[PDB]
């Protein structure tokens, strides 16, 4: 229940060029090779993963991260105009762990099914959290953790259709999206497997009409907005993928492959910022990410229904509930 | 100083779409979700939708979604409400609002000027007038302005000089689709033959200007 | 489905008095509630928001109270410019409002009649005007009648706000009809009923 400057480790090789390992080891320490871990006996404590500072210092280290990761050829704000040199870089997110320093310590929820705001009965006390991938995305959430137990969902208020909706899921389900070369550049194509995905979708429309029981639960389109709230955009070894979900987020899923299309792209949106990066093409080659979708963002239309149904549709932008999705189980407390 | 200032009034065909803008002036833009309520006349409030004006995410309300769409730019700090395949029920004025702070969005603490959108087919009409006549003590007289369309209907009586005892009702639309409504007057019995009364009608829309007087 | 249900639909109170309006939620809904005031040709104003924090140049005599699924608002000593509808909000929806008008003394309408132009007449239809004058309480029944012939499906009314001054009411009922359905009858009559009115009043004419 206070505030502190944490730090953070990680595993990043002094020699290795990949850029996020060239950033952690300038600003991260190693992993301590002895993690304590100590369960408070009867003890309950209230969490609030949506206010936590623990999320806004990993948005400032993930801001830095790209800073120097992914510099825009281009910058544009509502003041300020920046050209710079832009060469390409190895990418490939590491998992980074986050530490309270002396006279503080991080509280762990260990219930299972928390939804991250309320009183936590199986509490411990650690140094640092486990590892956690900065990875930047919209709509769906990748290489991150599972549920242990059930689907979980996460809302400020579940009441407010204005709140975002982050669901964990307990099983994860791959998704391969490649840009082959030997044409058209900047197309690519995601696979996904449509049974995998249509049963992991079913689970989460269960678990969510326990919320909203009586109810049809109903999976539709992002009902608009920046094409990197409307697709599911992600970086992958450097090039900004956005690809179309309108086949993931459906009534009508089907059991075999789905493919989804996906543009490389160049001008870019920033999350960090209101402003717009423009980077160079891509690159040459076969560009593949094959990521563990573990979780969702989604938002529910407002309004009562007039045919029982309630309608969800993928969300994303603000990069923090990314950030929560990890962090939810995780507080910062003095020691006194 | 926050500000809100939607465009000016609309009148449309059934069918059609239309436009409502709110440029936003005193905060940052893209800081607050901004929502569209309409308001029927004679009714209650009803929500439509709201946009995160940083990154565009919308939410409509489920009775208007497919044919509601909002946008916004930040550039000029203006958010766009577009609603298509218009009828009559969508008769109203549309206003833009924003919540007090940026955590909690339903507390409507700034709200425009409000944007009146008329849907019939009917077109632009002027007004005819006819005279309500009467008949000691005081006595009523008036003025029937009758078919006109669109609203409003300014009514004056002797060029602003008889002002208090004044009535003017509200129009009503009637079956085939034009406004009427009726202006009168109470005056004593010692002036239906020494004092003239003519009414002023202005209809803006079809550049009607009359002066129709009463008498008994 | 989510109600939020205002009562009551109208409120009479007299300057001075407190005024009391009840806002339900269908279901517990904790303490989100807002309530707004709006006046004739104006957009909503917030005056209460979490159920009891009075937005800001709202002056003290306005309190929100309540929780779960009851709620209220109480305006003590009513001023003039008081008078208005409120609406309750909870999310997305809105409460139906209740319209706080004046009270004052009963007044009896003074009743005029208005037979067709004739230069509507030399057009196609003819339209008979009935006025009801500076009245109170709102409440009136009008009926036409060819004398005993009573009429009914083609009368429009209108009523105006309450008056600033004197905290009457107006009303204006047209009785539209075809010229020659006009010219057929003759004993054209309208009739009131009204709270300040013993009996009912029949000004009226005929078509000579
Ligand atoms: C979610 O998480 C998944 C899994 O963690 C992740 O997918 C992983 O992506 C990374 C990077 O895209 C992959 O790592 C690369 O793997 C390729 C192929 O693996 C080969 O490795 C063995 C050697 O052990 C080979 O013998 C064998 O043929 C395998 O095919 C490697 O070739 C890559 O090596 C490059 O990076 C090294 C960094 O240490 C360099 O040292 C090395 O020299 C290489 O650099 C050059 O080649 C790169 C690849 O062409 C090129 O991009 C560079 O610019 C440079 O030219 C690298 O190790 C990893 O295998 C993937 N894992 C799985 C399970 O798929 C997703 O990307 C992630 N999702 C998101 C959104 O982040
Ligand atoms: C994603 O791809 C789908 C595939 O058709 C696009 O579909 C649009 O939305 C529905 C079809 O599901 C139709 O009403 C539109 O006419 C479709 N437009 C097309 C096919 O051009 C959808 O627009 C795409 N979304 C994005 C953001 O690119
Ligand atoms: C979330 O918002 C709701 C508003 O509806 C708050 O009120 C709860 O609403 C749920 C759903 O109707 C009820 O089951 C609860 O009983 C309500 N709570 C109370 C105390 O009445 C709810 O408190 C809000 N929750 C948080 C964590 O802010
Ligand atoms: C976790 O918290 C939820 C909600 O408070 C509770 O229902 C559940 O029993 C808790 N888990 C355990 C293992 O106690
Ligand atoms: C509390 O969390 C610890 C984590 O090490 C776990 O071993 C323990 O079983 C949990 N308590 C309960 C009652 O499950
Ligand atoms: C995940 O949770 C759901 C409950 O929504 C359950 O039906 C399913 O069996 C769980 N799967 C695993 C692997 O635990
Ligand atoms: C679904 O996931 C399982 C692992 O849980 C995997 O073995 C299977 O191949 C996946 N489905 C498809 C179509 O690949
Ligand atoms: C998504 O739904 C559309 C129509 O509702 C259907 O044509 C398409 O095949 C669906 N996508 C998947 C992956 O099932
Ligand atoms: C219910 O109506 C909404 C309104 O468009 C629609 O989006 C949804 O698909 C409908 N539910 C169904 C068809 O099950
Ligand atoms: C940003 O928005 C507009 C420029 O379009 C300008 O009026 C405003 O003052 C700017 N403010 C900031 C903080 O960027």
Redesign the interface.
């Known amino acids: 229940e206070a505030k502190t400057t944490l730090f953070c480790a990680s595993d990043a090789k002094a020699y290795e060029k990949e850029c996020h390992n060239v950033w952690a080891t300038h600003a991260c320490v190693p992993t301590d090779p002895n993690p304590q871990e100590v369960v408070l006996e009867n003890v309950t404590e209230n969490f609030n993963m949506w206010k936590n500072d623990m999320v806004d210092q990993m948005q400032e280290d993930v801001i830095s991260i790209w800073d120097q990761c992914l510099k825009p050829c281009v910058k544009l704000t509502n003041t300020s105009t920046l050209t710079q040199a832009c060469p390409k870089v190895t990418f490939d997110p590491i998992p980074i762990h986050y530490c309270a320093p002396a006279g503080y310590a991080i509280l762990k929820c260990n219930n299972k099914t928390f939804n991250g705001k309320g009183p936590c009965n199986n509490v411990s006390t650690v140094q640092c959290t486990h590892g956690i991938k900065p990875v930047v995305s919209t709509q769906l959430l990748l290489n991150g953790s599972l549920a242990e137990e059930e689907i979980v969902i996460r809302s400020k208020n579940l ?3 204005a709140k975002i909706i982050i669901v964990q899921l307990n099983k994860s389900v791959e998704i391969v999206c490649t840009r082959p070369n030997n044409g058209d550049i900047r197309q690519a194509y995601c696979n996904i497997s449509g049974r995998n995905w249509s049963e992991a979708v079913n689970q989460v429309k269960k678990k969510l009409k326990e919320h909203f029981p009586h109810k049809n639960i109903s999976f539709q389109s992002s009902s608009g907005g920046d094409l990197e709230i409307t697709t599911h955009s992600f970086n992958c070894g450097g090039e900004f993928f956005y690809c179309n979900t309108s086949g993931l987020f459906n009534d009508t899923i089907s059991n075999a492959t789905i493919m989804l299309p996906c543009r490389i792209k160049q001008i870019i949106n920033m999350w960090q910022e209101v402003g717009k990066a423009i980077y160079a093409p891509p690159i040459k080659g076969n560009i593949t990410c094959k990521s563990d979708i573990t979780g969702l963002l989604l938002l529910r239309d ?3 229904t007039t045919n029982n149904t309630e309608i969800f549709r993928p969300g994303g932008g603000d990069m923090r509930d990314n950030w929560r999705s990890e962090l939810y189980k995780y507080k910062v407390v003095e020691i006194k | 100083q926050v500000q809100l200032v939607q465009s000016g009034a609309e009148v449309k065909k059934p069918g059609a779409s239309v436009k409502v803008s709110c440029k936003a002036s005193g905060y940052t833009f893209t800081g607050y979700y901004m929502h569209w309520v309409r308001q029927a006349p004679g009714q ?4 439509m939708g709201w946009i995160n004006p940083n990154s565009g995410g919308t939410n409509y ?1 489920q009775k208007f979604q497919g044919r509601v769409t909002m946008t916004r730019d930040t550039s000029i700090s203006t958010a766009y409400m577009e609603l298509s395949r218009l009828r009559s029920d969508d008769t109203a004025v549309y ?1 833009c609002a924003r919540g ?1 702070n940026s955590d ?1 969005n ?4 700034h ?4 944007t009146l959108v008329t849907v019939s087919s009917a077109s632009t009409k002027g007004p ?1 007038v ?6 000691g003590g ?5 003025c ?1 302005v ?1 078919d006109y369309f669109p609203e409003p209907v300014t009514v004056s009586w002797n060029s602003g000089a008889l002002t208090s005892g004044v ?6 639309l ?1 079956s085939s689709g034009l406004y ?3 202006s ?1 007057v ?1 005056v004593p019995s010692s002036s239906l033959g020494t004092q003239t009364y003519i009414c002023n009608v202005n209809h803006k829309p079809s550049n009607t200007k009359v002066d129709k007087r009463v008498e008994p | ?2 109600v939020l249900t205002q009562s009551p639909a109208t409120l009479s109170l007299s300057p001075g008095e407190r005024a009391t309006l009840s806002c339900r939620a269908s279901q517990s ?1 904790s303490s ?1 509630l ?1 309530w ?1 005031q709006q006046k004739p040709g104006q ?4 005056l209460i ?2 159920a009891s924090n009075r ?2 140049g709202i002056p003290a005599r306005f309190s929100g109270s309540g929780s779960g699924t009851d709620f209220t608002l109480t305006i003590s000593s009513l001023e003039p410019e008081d008078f208005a509808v409120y ?1 309750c ?1 909870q ?7 209740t319209k706080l008008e004046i009270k004052r003394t009963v007044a009896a309408p ?1 009743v ?1 009649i ?1 037979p ?2 004739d ?2 007449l030399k ?1 196609g239809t003819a ?1 008979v ?1 009935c ?1 009801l ?1 500076n009245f109170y309480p709102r409440e009136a029944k009008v009926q036409w009648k060819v004398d005993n012939a009573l009429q009914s499906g083609n009368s ?5 706000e309450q008056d600033s001054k004197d905290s009457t009411y ?3 009922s ?1 009785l ?1 009809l075809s010229k020659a359905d006009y010219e057929k009858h003759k004993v054209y009559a309208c009739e009131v009923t009204h709270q300040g009115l013993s009996s009912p009043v029949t000004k009226s ?1 005929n078509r000579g």
Request: proline share 5%.
């Open positions: 009441s407010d259709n407002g309004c009562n | 209650g409030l009803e929500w309300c206003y007090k909690y339903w507390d409507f603490q709200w425009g000027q409000g005819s006819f005279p309500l006549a009467p008949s005081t006595a009523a007289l008036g029937l009758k009535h003017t009702f509200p129009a009503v009637q009427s409504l009726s009168v109470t | 489905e989510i809904v989100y807002a707004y957009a909503p104003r917030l928001y979490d937005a800001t609406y909000q999310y997305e929806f809105f409460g139906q409002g003074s005029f208005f067709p132009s230069e509507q057009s339209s005007v006025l004058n429009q009314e209108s009523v105006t107006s009303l204006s047209t539209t004419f």
